[PDB]
Coordinates of all heavy atoms in Angstrom, one line a residue:
Chain Y
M1 N 76.1 100.6 92.9 CA 76.0 101.2 94.2 C 75.9 102.7 94.1 O 76.6 103.3 93.4 CB 77.2 100.7 95.1 CG 77.1 101.2 96.6 SD 75.5 101.2 97.4 CE 75.2 99.4 97.4
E16 N 85.0 128.3 104.7 CA 83.7 128.9 104.2 C 82.6 127.9 104.5 O 82.5 126.8 103.9 CB 83.8 129.2 102.7 CG 82.9 130.3 102.2 CD 81.9 129.8 101.2 OE1 82.3 129.6 100.0 OE2 80.7 129.6 101.5
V18 N 79.5 127.6 103.7 CA 78.6 127.1 102.6 C 79.4 126.0 101.8 O 78.8 124.9 101.5 CB 78.2 128.2 101.6 CG1 77.5 127.7 100.4 CG2 77.2 129.2 102.3
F19 N 80.6 126.3 101.4 CA 81.4 125.3 100.7 C 81.6 124.1 101.6 O 81.6 122.9 101.1 CB 82.7 125.9 100.2 CG 83.4 125.0 99.1 CD1 82.8 124.6 98.0 CD2 84.7 124.5 99.4 CE1 83.4 123.8 97.1 CE2 85.3 123.7 98.4 CZ 84.6 123.4 97.3
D39 N 88.8 125.4 110.8 CA 90.1 126.0 111.1 C 91.2 125.0 110.9 O 91.1 123.9 111.5 CB 90.0 126.5 112.5 CG 91.2 127.4 112.8 OD1 91.2 128.6 112.4 OD2 92.2 126.9 113.4
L44 N 95.1 120.4 112.4 CA 96.4 119.9 112.9 C 96.3 119.2 114.2 O 96.8 118.1 114.3 CB 97.4 121.1 112.9 CG 98.8 120.7 113.3 CD1 99.4 119.7 112.4 CD2 99.7 121.9 113.4
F50 N 93.8 111.0 115.3 CA 92.8 110.5 114.3 C 93.5 110.4 113.0 O 94.3 111.3 112.6 CB 91.6 111.4 114.4 CG 90.7 111.4 113.2 CD1 89.7 110.4 113.1 CD2 90.7 112.3 112.2 CE1 88.8 110.3 112.1 CE2 89.8 112.3 111.2 CZ 88.9 111.3 111.1
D58 N 92.4 123.4 101.4 CA 92.9 124.5 100.5 C 94.3 124.9 101.0 O 94.5 124.9 102.2 CB 91.9 125.7 100.6 CG 92.1 126.7 99.5 OD1 93.2 126.8 98.9 OD2 91.1 127.5 99.2
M64 N 95.8 130.2 108.7 CA 97.1 129.5 108.7 C 97.2 128.7 107.3 O 96.5 127.7 107.2 CB 97.3 128.6 109.9 CG 98.4 127.5 109.7 SD 97.8 125.9 109.5 CE 99.2 124.9 109.9
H72 N 103.7 120.1 108.4 CA 103.7 119.5 109.8 C 103.4 118.1 109.8 O 104.1 117.3 110.5 CB 102.9 120.4 110.7 CG 103.6 121.7 110.9 ND1 104.8 121.8 111.4 CD2 103.2 123.0 110.7 CE1 105.2 123.1 111.5 NE2 104.2 123.8 111.0
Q79 N 101.3 109.4 106.2 CA 101.1 109.1 104.8 C 99.6 109.3 104.4 O 99.2 108.9 103.3 CB 101.4 107.6 104.6 CG 102.8 107.3 105.2 CD 103.9 108.0 104.5 OE1 104.7 108.7 105.1 NE2 103.9 108.0 103.1
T88 N 94.1 128.9 93.9 CA 95.4 129.5 93.8 C 95.9 129.4 92.3 O 95.7 128.3 91.7 CB 96.5 128.9 94.7 OG1 97.6 129.7 94.7 CG2 96.8 127.5 94.2

Side-chain angles (χ1 to χ4, degrees):
Chain Y
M1 182 41 62
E16 206 240 288
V18 171
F19 194 57
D39 190 81
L44 184 57
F50 161 81
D58 193 337
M64 164 253 199
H72 289 302
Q79 312 297 126
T88 194

